[PDB]
Amino acid sequence: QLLPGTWQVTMTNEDGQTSQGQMHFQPRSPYTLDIVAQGTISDGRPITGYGKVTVKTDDTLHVNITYPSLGNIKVQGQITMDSPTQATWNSTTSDGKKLTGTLQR
Numbered sequence: 753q754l755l756p757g758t759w760q761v762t763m764t765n766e767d768g769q770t771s772q773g774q775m776h777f778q779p780r781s782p783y784t785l786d787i788v789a790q791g792t793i794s795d796g797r798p799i800t801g802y803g804k805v806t807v808k809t810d811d812t813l814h815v816n817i818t819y820p821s822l823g824n825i826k827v828q829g830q831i832t833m834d835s836p837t838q839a840t841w842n843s844t845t846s847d848g849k850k851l852t853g854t855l856q857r
């Protein structure tokens with residue numbers, strides 16, 4: 753219920769790069785929210801991505817997102833709602849790299 757809206761996002765990946773940008777969550781049904789993402793990686797690559805947060809019966813928040821601006825790499829992971837104003841992003845890219853970030857509202 754707290755996800756919908758815009759979040760400021762900072763991330764770091766296993767290649768030692770960092771990223772900054774935003775994620776925007778749109779409620780769709782009781783079991784899914786749509787996500788769109790914008791930002792920039794520390795190597796200069798622009799970030800444009802879109803996906804879905806799927807909610808399982810145990811309330812786990814699974815995220816799948818594809819990034820056309822990064823050669824269509826895909827990211828799959830889980831969001832952990834630490835508080836009403838903070839969430840943690842743990843994921844792995846389709847290249848096999850860890851991607852960790854923090855969402856702040």
Ligand SMILES: CC1=N/C(=C\c2cc(F)c(O)c(F)c2)C(=O)N1C
Nearest residue numbers: 761763765771772773774789790791
């Ligand atoms: C800041 C930010 N980085 C994102 C994705 C992202 C960042 C990275 F550093 C990656 O290597 C990568 F494969 C994806 C994203 O969606 N946002 C909002």
